Amino acid sequence: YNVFPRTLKWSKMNLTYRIVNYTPDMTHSEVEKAFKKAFKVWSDVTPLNFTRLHDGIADIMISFGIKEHGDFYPFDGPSGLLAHAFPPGPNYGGDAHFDDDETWTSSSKGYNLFLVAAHEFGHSLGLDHSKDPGALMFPIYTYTGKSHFMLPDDDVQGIQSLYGPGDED
Ligand SMILES: NC(=O)[C@H](CCC(=O)O)NC(=O)CCc1ccc(-c2ccc(-c3ccccc3)cc2)cc1
Ligand SMILES: [Ca+2]
Ligand SMILES: [Ca+2]
Ligand SMILES: [Ca+2]
Ligand SMILES: [Zn+2]
Ligand SMILES: [Zn+2]
C-alpha cells in the first residue's frame, strides 16, 4: 500500500459527513446506505468514527456531478473516471465527488456505488493507490459478488499505519 506524500492525515478520529445531493439511479435511502456501508469498511478496522450531519459543512462532503461540476476537475461522461476524492485536510480535504454520468447501482448492473465509495473514502482518509492487485486501493475498478465485503489485508495495513487498529477486548 501507499499513503499520500506528506502523510496528510486526520488528527481527529470523530469525523462527520453529509451527502449534499443524490443520483437519480438509486433511491435516497439506497444511496445513504451505500455510503454508510462504505464508511463502516474503514471504521471497523480503526478508531475512526463517521457521523451523518443534518446540515451545514461536514468533514466529508459527498456529492454527485457531471462534466464541469464546480471544481477544476471535470468528469468525462459515461465510463472512464468514476469519482474522485480529496486527501485529508481542511475545507475540501476529505470531500468525495461521484460522476453522475455513470449508472450507479447496489448490484452488478452499472457501477456499484458502495465499492467506488469505499475506494474513494480510502483516499479521503489518506491512502494512495496500492501496487497490490488484490487491494481495494488498486486503481482499477473491480466488482465482487460477496454479501459481506472483506476489506483486503493490504488496505487494513495501510489504514492502520495511519490510525492504528480498532478497539479491544
Ligand atoms: N480514472 C481516474 O483517473 C480516476 C482517479 C480517481 C481515483 O483513482 O479515485 N479513477 C477512478 O475513477 C476509478 C476509481 C475507483 C473506484 C473503485 C475501485 C475499486 C477497486 C477494487 C475493488 C475491490 C477490491 C477487492 C475486492 C472486491 C472489489 C472495488 C473498487 C478502484 C478505483
Ligand atoms: Ca465518467
Ligand atoms: Ca472537507
Ligand atoms: Ca446517473
Ligand atoms: Zn469534483
Ligand atoms: Zn483511486
From Swiss-Prot:
Tissues expressed in: Detected in fetal cartilage and calvaria, in chondrocytes of hypertrophic cartilage in vertebrae and in the dorsal end of ribs undergoing ossification, as well as in osteoblasts and periosteal cells below the inner periosteal region of ossified ribs. Detected in chondrocytes from in joint cartilage that have been treated with TNF and IL1B, but not in untreated chondrocytes. Detected in T lymphocytes. Detected in breast carcinoma tissue.
For the ligand (Zn(2+) 1), the binding residues are H69, D71, H84, H97
The organism's superkingdom is given as Eukaryota
In which residues is Ca(2+) 1 bound?
D25, D100, E102
User: What induces this one?
Assistant: Up-regulated by TNF and IL1B.
The alphabetized UniProt keywords are: Calcium, Collagen degradation, Disease variant, Disulfide bond, Dwarfism, Extracellular matrix, Glycoprotein, Hydrolase, Metal-binding, Metalloprotease, Phosphoprotein, Protease, Repeat, Secreted, Signal, Zinc, Zymogen
Active-site feature positions: E120
Q: Which residues are glycosylated?
A: N14, N49
Please list the residues that bind Ca(2+) 3. D76, G77, S79, L81, D99, E102
Q: Where is the segment annotated Interaction with TIMP2?
A: 73-143
Q: Which GO terms describe its cellular component?
A: extracellular matrix; extracellular region; extracellular space
Kindly report the protein's main subcellular placement as a broad class: secreted
Q: Where in the cell is it found?
A: Secreted, Extracellular space, Extracellular matrix; Secreted
Q: Which GO terms describe its biological process?
A: bone mineralization; bone morphogenesis; collagen catabolic process; endochondral ossification; extracellular matrix disassembly; extracellular matrix organization; growth plate cartilage development; proteolysis
- What is this protein's function per UniProt? Plays a role in the degradation of extracellular matrix proteins including fibrillar collagen, fibronectin, TNC and ACAN. Cleaves triple helical collagens, including type I, type II and type III collagen, but has the highest activity with soluble type II collagen. Can also degrade collagen type IV, type XIV and type X. May also function by activating or degrading key regulatory proteins, such as TGFB1 and CCN2. Plays a role in wound healing, tissue remodeling, cartilage degradation, bone development, bone mineralization and ossification.
Note on domains (UniProt) = The conserved cysteine present in the cysteine-switch motif binds the catalytic zinc ion, thus inhibiting the enzyme. The dissociation of the cysteine from the zinc ion upon the activation-peptide release activates the enzyme.
* Oligomeric and partner information: Monomer. Interacts with TIMP1, TIMP2 and TIMP3. Binds (via the C-terminal region) to collagen.
Q: What is this protein called?
A: Collagenase 3
Recorded source organism is Homo sapiens (Human)
Residue span relative to the full protein: 104 to 272 of 471
